[PDB]
Write a protein that binds this ligand. Structure first.
Ligand SMILES: [Cu+2]
Ligand SMILES: [Cu+2]
Ligand SMILES: [Cu+2]
Lengths: 102, 102, 102
């Protein structure tokens, strides 16, 4: 399995996108929590309050999921970050496979 | 070293389990923070408020730790997710080894 | 690209350090959020409220970034944890490369 991390400008977009991804059976679950982001914009350090999203899905769904996030994301240039899971308890993995599209 | 991520239904269970794992010297530390989870239950998108837990330990303790989490977890099917750490500052790694069981 | 995770004792140190790292062009962005940490200190389970920081940068900047965090960190023994990113959308990766030092 894999984790995918992305960030959203607030809760309405984060929840809309995550619920669409669940409906499309591209993810098994999402964990959403606020953070404060700091980055460069035009020679200045910018802050933005955001909602980060930790998504859990199968490896084989990565490219499809990445494309759908690109298509749904409120940001022109979103972060869509895949981190592979090195091991997981089998009962959870079985559930995640059951809950994702075939 | 490794990270292990799991989620709990609230703070009392999260803290009880993490403190037991510390007492058993199976982890060196835990970072706990709230999130909102979205997933499928019986044809419906369900939300649950949870406490996520980021645990830090040695690679060689993974199987023992995974079994103990299974045995302590309030969920029938918990997420117990191992992500390997590709590098870490040595002083921290030494501390983590010192603080975990031998 | 890589993620680097570290923790700070509160927001002032976290923001000062992250903004210095941005100014030095060692990271492209940071996501900061509170957590509660549990760990061993002198035979007792200790808790501390902290700010965790998720940093995003290039692989080739890891050693320089790790040294700078050591030099800036309020902790004697900070956690400075590198997790490699297995894949990312190209538009984001291009932006991250553009925003980091050359
Ligand atoms: Cu905002
Ligand atoms: Cu709940
Ligand atoms: Cu504190």
């Amino acid at each position: 399995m894999i984790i995918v991390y992305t960030t959203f400008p607030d809760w309405e977009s984060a929840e809309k996108v995550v619920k669409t991804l669940l409906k499309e059976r591209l993810i098994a679950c999402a964990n959403l929590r606020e953070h404060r982001a700091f980055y460069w914009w035009e020679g200045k350090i910018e802050e933005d309050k955001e909602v980060g999203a930790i998504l859990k899905t199968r490896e084989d769904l990565w490219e499809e999921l990445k494309e759908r996030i690109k298509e749904l994301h409120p940001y022109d240039v979103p972060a869509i970050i895949r981190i592979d899971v090195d091991d997981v308890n089998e009962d959870y993995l079985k559930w995640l496979i059951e809950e994702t599209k075939k």
